[PDB]
Each structure stands twice: as structure tokens, then as C-alpha cells.
Amino acid sequence: LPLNLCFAAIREDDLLLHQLLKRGLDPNESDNNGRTPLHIAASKGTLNCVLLLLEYHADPNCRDAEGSVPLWEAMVEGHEKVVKVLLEHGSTIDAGDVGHFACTAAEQGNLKLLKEIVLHGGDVTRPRATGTSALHTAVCEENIEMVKYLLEQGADVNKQDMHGWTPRDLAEQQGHEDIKALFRE
Ligand SMILES: [Mg+2]
Ligand SMILES: [Mg+2]
Incomplete structure (x- = not known):
């Protein structure tokens, strides 16, 4: 030491x-x-x-x-x-790396932390270098409220990660009608 x-x-x-x-x-x-x-x-x-x-x-x-x-x-x-x-x-x-910060907050189900990033001028719609975004992660975690906020913040629903998946693509596969219903509007 x-x-x-x-x-x-x-x-x-x-x-x-x-x-x-x-x-x-x-x-x-x-x-x-x-x-x-x-x-x-x-x-x-x-x-x-x-x-x-x-x-x-x-x-x-x-x-x-x-x-x-x-x-x-x-x-x-x-x-x-x-x-x-x-x-x-x-x-x-x-x-x-705000994209990374944003994804981490999403991974921890921490919506208040996402808002604080925004409060301090961070763009929480930015992706990781891998192309994953907090919206991707929000869909997987099936976090309804977090999906709203991210959408309201202008989160790209057609953003492809490095494996070709968009947040919308992911919503259909988890059959979360509530969340897919929000993608339509
Ligand atoms: Mg001390
Ligand atoms: Mg000095």
C-alpha cells in the first residue's frame, strides 16, 4: 500500500x-x-x-x-x-461521458438522477459509444415513468445500438403494451 x-x-x-x-x-x-x-x-x-x-x-x-x-x-x-x-x-x-451516466441511472432505476443530469445541463438522450441509450435500458427495465421522461426529453426511438436494436424494437419483444402504446404517440 x-x-x-x-x-x-x-x-x-x-x-x-x-x-x-x-x-x-x-x-x-x-x-x-x-x-x-x-x-x-x-x-x-x-x-x-x-x-x-x-x-x-x-x-x-x-x-x-x-x-x-x-x-x-x-x-x-x-x-x-x-x-x-x-x-x-x-x-x-x-x-x-453523459451518455454513460444516463445509461447507468437507467440501469439503477434512478429517475431522480436522470433529472439531475438534466438539471445540470446534461443531454440524457446521448448514447454510450456502444449505441445503447438510457431509453433502450428503460424499455428493458420496463420502467414506465422513466420511458415517459426520456421520451419527453426527446429520446431517439429509432436509435440502433451496436446490435441493431432500437428502443421501439425492444418494446415489442417484451410485450409491455403500456410501453408500446407510448411509442405510438
Ligand atoms: Mg474527517
Ligand atoms: Mg496553491
Whole structure:
């Protein structure tokens, strides 16, 4: 176990983190997956760690390997105070892979998270690079309300994933009349 900023952030040890920051450790140094201590602090919701990292010039819009950003790490775990502080420092949701974020929210049946992406200016109709969209996923999960919202947000019903399926195509195969009925209008 190396003694680095991630070590402290993972353990929510803001005193240790502070001491390491004063010793000159670089908060913009990331692990093998592009994870920074600010990713981790934002995920754990440790406000003191977040503030100290930002003070020592952690990039508020840092992207890891999955395209995740500190703002999203905080949003997924419901750390509203950290979200506010990150926004104040210039974090934007569209700095990350919003398509991926959107699909993840759909996969977790989390409609409030989908709306928060939109609140912060994210286009939740964007697909993953694989072509899957939150609408695709919403159909599979047969999440009626989430399908509405996504449709109301302008979600492409004829968007083909990499396996040729559109959200509409999927609706017919699951025989969810309620959902197919919504595709007609
Ligand atoms: Mg503490
Ligand atoms: Mg400085």
C-alpha cells in the first residue's frame, strides 16, 4: 500500500490528506484507471477532503477511464453538499461521458438522477459509444415513468445500438403494451 493521496481519501482521513498535501503530493496524479483523490473524496462525500483538494488545485473536471467526473461521483451517492461545492468551482456534468451516466441511472432505476443530469445541463438522450441509450435500458427495465421522461426529453426511438436494436424494437419483444402504446404517440 503506497502512502498517497488516494490512500487518505479512500479512508476519509482529511487530517492525513492535509498533511500529505502540505508535503507536496500532487492531487492531479491518478491511479492506473485515471482515478484521482478528488474522484474518491467526491464519491465518499467527504467535504473537508474535497475542499482541501480543490485548494491544492485538484482539477474539478478530471475524467477517469470510464469517463466519470467528480461531480457525477457525488451525484450518484447523493452527496448534495459536495455537488454544490463542485459546481461552485466550475465542475460541469458535460465534462464527463453523459451518455454513460444516463445509461447507468437507467440501469439503477434512478429517475431522480436522470433529472439531475438534466438539471445540470446534461443531454440524457446521448448514447454510450456502444449505441445503447438510457431509453433502450428503460424499455428493458420496463420502467414506465422513466420511458415517459426520456421520451419527453426527446429520446431517439429509432436509435440502433451496436446490435441493431432500437428502443421501439425492444418494446415489442417484451410485450409491455403500456410501453408500446407510448411509442405510438
Ligand atoms: Mg474527517
Ligand atoms: Mg496553491
